[PDB]
Design a protein around this ligand. Structure first.
Ligand SMILES: *[C@@H]1O[C@H](CO)[C@@H](O[C@@H]2O[C@H](CO)[C@@H](O)[C@H](O)[C@H]2NC(C)=O)[C@H](O)[C@H]1NC(C)=O
Ligand SMILES: *[C@@H]1O[C@H](CO)[C@@H](O[C@@H]2O[C@H](CO)[C@@H](O)[C@H](O)[C@H]2NC(C)=O)[C@H](O)[C@H]1NC(C)=O
Ligand SMILES: *[C@@H]1O[C@H](CO)[C@@H](O)[C@H](O)[C@H]1NC(C)=O
Lengths: 50, 57
């Protein structure tokens, strides 16, 4: 395991789908909030229904 | 453009993700997008422009 900052791992992962790295950094707050909110929807879905 | 920025402690280089080959940072191995403000954890360094000493002849 080689450490890398998570905002730099996600820029590699954007670059791996043909989306240029700056699209992450210029939207990092938004992309982080969409991930956090989507994890919230997973808790709400799993808590709501079996 | 490809690879990642690193510092040895005093100088900044761009290098491949999977094998350390430190390259001097230039307008050829990097691309711009916008101004400093938006990027969480941006840092300040020179980026060399390979054209300028050539046209300075
Ligand atoms: C970081 O890398 C740079 C470039 O490889 C090193 O700077 C050179 O160091 C040698 C030995 O002190 C000098 O003879 C050169 O003139 C230096 N070049 C430049 C452009 O300054 C630097 O020593 C490295 N720093 C660390 C902490 O390893
Ligand atoms: C990167 O360098 C710039 C200057 O090249 C720094 O900007 C100055 O920062 C101080 C303190 O916030 C301000 O009073 C100046 O007005 C700024 N000048 C300009 C031209 O913007 C910047 O702070 C540096 N960033 C880091 C992280 O060190
Ligand atoms: C990195 O995190 C430390 C605390 O862990 C903080 O002091 C520092 O300001 C942070 N730097 C950046 C670039 O976010």
């Amino acid at each position: 395991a080689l450490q890398i900052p998570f905002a730099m791992q996600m820029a590699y992962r954007f670059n791996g789908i043909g989306v240029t790295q700056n699209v992450l950094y210029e939207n990092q707050k938004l992309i982080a909030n969409q991930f956090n909110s989507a994890i919230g929807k997973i808790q709400d879905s799993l808590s709501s229904t079996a | 453009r490809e690879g990642v920025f690193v510092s040895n402690g005093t100088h900044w280089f761009v290098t491949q993700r999977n094998f350390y080959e430190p390259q001097i940072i230039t307008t050829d191995n990097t691309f711009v997008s916008g101004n400093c403000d938006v990027v969480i954890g941006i840092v300040n360094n020179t980026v060399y422009d390979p054209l300028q000493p050539e046209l300075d002849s």
